[PDB]
Amino acid sequence: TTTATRLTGWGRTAPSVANVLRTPDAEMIVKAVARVAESGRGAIARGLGRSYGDNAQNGGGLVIDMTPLNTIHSIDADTKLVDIDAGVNLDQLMKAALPFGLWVPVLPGTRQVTVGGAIACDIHGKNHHSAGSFGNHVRSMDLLTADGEIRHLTPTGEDAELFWATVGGNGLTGIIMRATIEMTPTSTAYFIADGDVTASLDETIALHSDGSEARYTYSSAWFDAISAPPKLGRAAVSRGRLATVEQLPAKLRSEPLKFDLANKYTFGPIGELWYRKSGTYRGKVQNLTQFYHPLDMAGFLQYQFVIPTEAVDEFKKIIGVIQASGHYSFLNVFKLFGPRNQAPLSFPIPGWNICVDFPIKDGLGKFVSELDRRVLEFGGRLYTAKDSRTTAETFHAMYPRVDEWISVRRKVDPLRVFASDMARRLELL
Ligand SMILES: Cc1cc2nc3c(=O)[nH]c(=O)nc-3n(C[C@H](O)[C@H](O)[C@H](O)COP(=O)(O)OP(=O)(O)OC[C@H]3O[C@@H](n4cnc5c(N)ncnc54)[C@H](O)[C@@H]3O)c2cc1C
Ligand SMILES: O=c1nc(N2CCCCC2)sc2c(NO)cc(C(F)(F)F)cc12
């Protein structure tokens, strides 16, 4: 079913109309690409549309919806390998793999993302400093390339260059049809978590520098970006690891792999004490929602960037520029990222990662451009999955291996068959 449809990112801006093919037939998808390879607005895959930007739309072009390709082919507990269609979402995968004592190795902050989208944006999670990003756990993928052929890529094979170009490649090397992922063994669906509350930016940084991070596989913090210094950058830090069966309480040991406001006090000293109490704890047993999606149970601009580890002073500065700006962000996530991977367009690098969420109002666009500049000057970068407004020139300087990447893309799609709004804006075409 080919249908002219109006598509936007999760942020619901920069709308664009395209011919949306939605089919469960992989043979239909190979033909639509062959067709597009004849006649020149190109094609692009789309997952669940959870990316905020314009990387999954192609104005006046073809957009292939991959979510009907959602078959899990096999799960093997001994090898820890799952073999799945690209349109399988990580929530679906999570529930399918638990009974085998397997855990999805990298989870983002929403489980409604496809494997293809997980690979194409090379997503990260609370465990990046211990496990890397999603691409590090893919052992193979089958990629529908511009020549109508389906190539079988692996991280260390002869096609390693193309594999790593596809990881974080935002769909611009072809369609990931199928992949094999190595899962993390687990005896439990639960976490054991430690909580800590800091009073300032310099404490937060101290906590993340003292060596405690190495004792936790998962870590992230809620972060104050409004309150002026000294309060600026105080945080609720939440850290932990998957629980073993031995560490669960009686009630949960029979089904260990299961899954199924303001008052007058709030802003005074009693609230400060209460919040400090609630956010301080040791060895709390917690399920996925409680630990990983604590938010559970349009008109905003999402902005995420990472600054190199060494440039700690420069990070403090950027955070100060944000609270002084008049633009207030209430929901902020902070994390120290670990080592990077071989993918040239992969976002994560070791250093200070922060996500902020600004209300759309007058002055924002021009303030965010100036932020881009500070982020660039300080050796950091923005995340494509959260962006629709940065310039090609900024992007290119932020990702110095883009040229290396462009070369790989030139060989595999010399006719520019795969294209998107983002590719044209960021001049990756
Ligand atoms: C509330 C929320 C929280 C989030 N938290 C995080 C987080 O913690 N960490 C993180 O890293 N990201 C996070 N994200 C971003 C999200 O993980 C990525 O945007 C992800 O790529 C979206 O997956 P999707 O399946 O919706 O892909 P879409 O948004 O539909 O597409 C995204 C990109 O993947 C490509 N693509 C999709 N399918 C295929 C395929 N089969 N073959 C080739 N290319 C394909 C598209 O062409 C496009 O370039 C979050 C997003 C939201 C809305
Ligand atoms: O857990 C997360 N939840 C998020 N969302 C749900 C709550 C509301 C806003 C979106 S965003 C996010 C980001 N930024 O993208 C980074 C990290 C990380 F650094 F990996 F720890 C975690 C999250």
Could you write out the three-class secondary structure of the chain? Answer: CEEEEEECCCCCCCCEEEEEEECCCHHHHHHHHHHHCCCCCCEEEECCCCCCCCCCCCCCCEEEECCCCCCEEEEECCCCEEEEECCCEHHHHHHHHHHHCEECCCCCCCCCCEHHHHHHCCCCCCCHHHHCCHHHHEEEEEEECCCCCEEEECCCCCCHHHHHHHCCCCCCCCEEEEEEEECEECCCCCEEEEEEECCCHHHHHHHHHCCHHHHCCEEEEEECCCCCCCCCCCEEEEEEEECCHHHCCHHHCCCCCCCCCCCCCCCCHHHHHHHHHHCCEEEEEECHHHHHCCCCCCCEEEEEEEEECCCHHHHHHHHHHHHCCCCCCCCCEEEEECCCCCCCCCCCCCEEEEEEEEECCCCHHHHHHHHHHHHHHCCCEECHHHCCCCCHHHHHHHCCCHHHHHHHHHHHCCCCCECCHHHHHCCCC
Tell me the Cα Rg of the chain.
22
Cα 168 to ligand 2 centre (Å): 18
Where b means 16+ CB within 10 Å and e means fewer, 333-350 reads bbbbbbebbbbbbbbbbb
- Residue with the nearest Cα to atom 52 of ligand 1? 50
Give yes or no for residue 304 CB within 6 A of ligand 2. yes
What is the DSSP pairing of strand 300-308 with strand 381-382? Answer: antiparallel
C-alpha to C-alpha distance for 252 and 59, rounded to whole angstroms? 51
In the sheet with 218-223, reading across from the earlier edge strand, the strands are 281-286, 191-197, 235-242, 218-223, 333-337, 351-359, 300-308, 381-382
Give yes or no for residue 66 CB within 6 A of ligand 1. yes
C-alpha to C-alpha distance for 303 and 193, rounded to whole angstroms? 28
- Do residues 58 and 18 make contact, with C-beta atoms less than 8 angstroms apart? yes
Question: Is 218 within any annotated ligand binding site?
Answer: no
Resolution in A: 2.5
Cα 304 to ligand 1 centre (Å): 14
- Do residues 101 and 182 make contact, with C-beta atoms less than 8 angstroms apart? no
* Those residues with Cβ within 8 angstroms of residue 233's Cβ, 6 or more apart along the chain or in another chain: 198, 200, 201, 202, 204, 205, 223, 224, 225, 316, 319, 334
Ligand nearest to the CA of 56: 1
Cα 258 to ligand 2 centre (Å): 24
Tokens of 71: 């078959």
Give yes or no for residue 168 CB within 6 A of ligand 1. no
Give yes or no for residue 144 CB within 6 A of ligand 1. no
Cα 117 to ligand 1 centre (Å): 4
C-alpha to C-alpha distance for 132 and 88, rounded to whole angstroms? 21
- Residue with the nearest Cα to atom 12 of ligand 2? 109
C-alpha to C-alpha distance for 48 and 90, rounded to whole angstroms? 11
The coordinates were experimentally obtained by X-ray
Give yes or no for residue 46 CB within 6 A of ligand 1. yes
Among the listed residues 45, 50, 57, 61, the one whose alpha carbon sits nearest the alpha carbon of residue 7: 57
Q: Where are the domains of the chain?
A: 1-429
Among the listed residues 330, 303, 339, the one whose alpha carbon sits nearest the alpha carbon of residue 318: 303
Residue type, 272: E
Cα 109 to ligand 2 centre (Å): 5
- Residue with the nearest Cα to atom 16 of ligand 2? 333
Helix axes 201-209, 312-323, angle to 10 degrees: 150
